[PDB]
């Protein structure tokens, strides 16, 4: 009887949420940016193509130094590039072939990957001999690890296919905080610029905002119709964008706590695999399954260029921290630097 | 300056790194990766036990050809996002408990979703209709009827292209080929030449299963080669 009245009371609470969200919708981002001058057609050319990977390049991450990359492939290799001189700085052989993510530590000392073995493997670059050794295995997740992003040398947040994000302590190797709330597989993260909040789009058409210290879900954002595959914060950390299998990208505002703009074309019926922002946040780059990466005017929803180039779906995308490039991996095994 | 020296050490390190990726390219192209994908009741555990030398990897070789078979055990039941990792595998070994009538539409619907997936519409399936000895006992008992869970079985006769083992009742052969034809009815209704289905009838005590997969992987590679020539 109490369980019967709780679900309808829960439906009562979201009735206030819908009232509160429409109470603050006095305008539209499509209405305020009507008089903004267009960014114009953005011509981008493949500056470098980084070859070396035997199988699908399934993830990728730039360094803070804006020069080195990392790439993970399903062949079980993990290669640190030097996109300036297209050289392979390292090529870490992974224990498990099936790796679904990778990160480069912001200090640049470490690399972490993991995938279908449910573990996150920290790799140390600055070793004694000069090789790369597995610093730690972070075991404790009950599903495939979908995305792990570093905070410091000693903390890492990991997504999982078991509807759970977690914050680890690399020194000790156990989860310090566990984030629970999602209904389906968690597919992506993005840390805040200030590294106090992070979002997580799962396979339940719903992205949540988390407080890393507090360890609890602050706000949940819905608006998508299918699995959310990519997510990134806006460069000021007051907003983020999400891709999905419903072939749309959405801009959310955290303070307004509702959807702000949608990024769809009638010609697009393929899901978004990756999303990223330029340094100013004026562009929204987005990979697709149709092998392209459409470039969006993030304040006018107008497609403003296309990064065609890839023979297979674009797995990963990434704008460099200085903003002077974008890298795009694919299942054709070729990273491509654009500019 | 020593600016040349740093660049000289970089091309030196890339030269060394690149010559392992060539050695690693040889072994990677050599080995055939397989995805073993069944049910808890299917009895995948006994096919792996018949393979002789998070995600359980089993190695075996036949005629000096290496095979790597992955049992993705450790993920949850929702398999629409890790199934995409295996779009490059040589074949999907599907194991079905042919004796378990209640769950066969689960197996058929799973088979249909793999067949018609965007990212698996070029991966051939080596279907293994396991637990044939249990199906034989179930049919001869006459307690549980296939017609209960499949009303199309009322009007079905053993196909002419049939190779029953001696001492098999005509009853057991109808049931065997009806179950198998339900899978082949899905396989023949789409796919349009990119991928094929290889049904086999496997017991728990059967031994020639590594050979069957070696044979069916050879057929998969042959047909891959001779579609680039537009011959098939």
């Amino acid at each position: 009887s109490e369980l019967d009245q709780l679900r309808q009371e829960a439906e009562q609470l979201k009735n206030q949420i819908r009232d509160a969200r429409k109470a603050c919708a006095d305008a539209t981002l499509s209405q305020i940016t009507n008089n903004i001058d267009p960014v114009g057609r953005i011509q981008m050319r493949t500056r470098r193509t980084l070859r070396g990977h035997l199988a699908k390049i399934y993830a990728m991450h730039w360094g803070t130094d804006s020069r080195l990359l990392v790439s993970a492939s399903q062949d079980g290799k993990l290669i640190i590039w030097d996109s300036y001189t297209t050289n392979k700085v390292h090529a870490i052989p992974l224990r498990s072939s099936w790796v679904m993510t990778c990160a480069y530590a912001p200090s640049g000392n470490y690399v972490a990957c993991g995938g279908l073995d449910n573990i996150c493997s920290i790799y140390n670059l600055k070793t004694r001999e000069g090789n790369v050794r597995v610093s730690r295995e972070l075991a404790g997740h009950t599903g495939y690890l979908s995305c792990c992003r570093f905070l410091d040398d000693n903390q890492i947040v990991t997504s999982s296919g078991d509807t759970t994000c977690a914050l680890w302590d690399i020194e000790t190797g156990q989860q310090t905080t566990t984030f629970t709330g999602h209904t389906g597989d968690v597919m992506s993260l993005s840390l805040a610029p200030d590294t106090r909040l992070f979002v997580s789009g799962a396979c339940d058409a719903s992205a949540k905002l988390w407080d890393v210290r507090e360890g609890m879900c602050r706000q949940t954002f819905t608006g998508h119709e299918s699995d959310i595959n990519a997510i990134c914060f806006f460069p000021n950390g007051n907003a983020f964008a999400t891709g999905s299998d419903d072939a749309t990208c959405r801009l959310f505002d955290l303070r307004a706590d509702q959807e702000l703009m949608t990024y769809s074309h009638d010609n697009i019926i393929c899901g978004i695999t990756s999303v990223s922002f330029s340094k100013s946040g004026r562009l929204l780059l987005a990979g697709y399954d149709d092998f392209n990466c459409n470039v969006w005017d993030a304040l006018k929803a107008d497609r403003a260029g296309v990064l065609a180039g890839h023979d297979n779906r674009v797995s990963c995308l990434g704008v460099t921290d200085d903003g002077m490039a974008v890298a795009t991996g694919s299942w054709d095994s070729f990273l491509k630097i654009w500019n | 300056e020593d600016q040349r020296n740093e660049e000289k050490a970089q091309r030196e390190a890339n030269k060394k790194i690149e010559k392992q990726l060539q050695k690693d390219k040889q072994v990677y192209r050599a080995t055939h990766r397989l995805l073993l994908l069944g049910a808890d009741n299917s009895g995948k555990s006994t096919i792996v036990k018949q393979m002789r030398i998070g995600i359980f990897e089993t190695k075996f070789q036949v005629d000096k050809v290496n095979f790597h078979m992955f049992d993705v055990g450790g993920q949850r039941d929702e398999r629409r996002k890790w199934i995409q990792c295996f779009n490059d595998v040589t074949a999907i070994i599907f194991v079905v408990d042919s004796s378990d009538y209640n769950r066969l539409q689960e197996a058929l619907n799973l088979f249909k979703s793999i067949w018609n997936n965007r990212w698996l519409r070029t991966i051939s399936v080596i279907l293994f209709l396991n637990k044939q000895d249990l199906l034989a006992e179930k049919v001869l008992a006459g307690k549980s009827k296939i017609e209960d869970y499949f009303p199309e079985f009322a009007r079905y006769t053993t196909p002419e292209d049939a190779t029953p083992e001696p001492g098999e009742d005509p009853r057991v052969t109808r049931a065997k080929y009806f179950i198998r034809d339900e899978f082949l009815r899905i396989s023949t209704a789409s796919g349009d030449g990119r991928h094929y289905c290889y049904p086999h009838f496997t017991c728990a005590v059967d031994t020639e299963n590594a050979r069957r997969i070696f044979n069916d992987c050879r057929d998969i590679i042959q047909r891959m080669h001779l579609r680039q020539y537009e011959l098939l």
Partner: nanobody
Amino acid sequence: QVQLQESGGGLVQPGGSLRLSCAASGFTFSNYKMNWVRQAPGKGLEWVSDISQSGASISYTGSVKGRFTISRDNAKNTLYLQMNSLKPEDTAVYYCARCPAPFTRDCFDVTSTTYAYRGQGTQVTVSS
């Protein structure tokens, strides 16, 4: 938000009639294949029937074929399941499930334990 509110179902004598209705909102109902799944007491979820985006690729499970009809109305954004000549075998909770992604001929984990795009369900019970 993706809402699939179910309707119909209740205590029906054997060989009775029923019509289950799920109302869909927060997505374009015409882009997805809609399914019906049920969970018998003491058993796991089982798939009942599906229907393509257009409404021309209907399939049923063996147990209920010719005995149930599934229909959809894209204008109304609703999905129907006509049930007649019921059995004591048919007592279960009927959930209106939606394919995970749009414009696909494949549905991958509609009958899974924790699925996002499924209804809360209606108890259809058949007895005296």
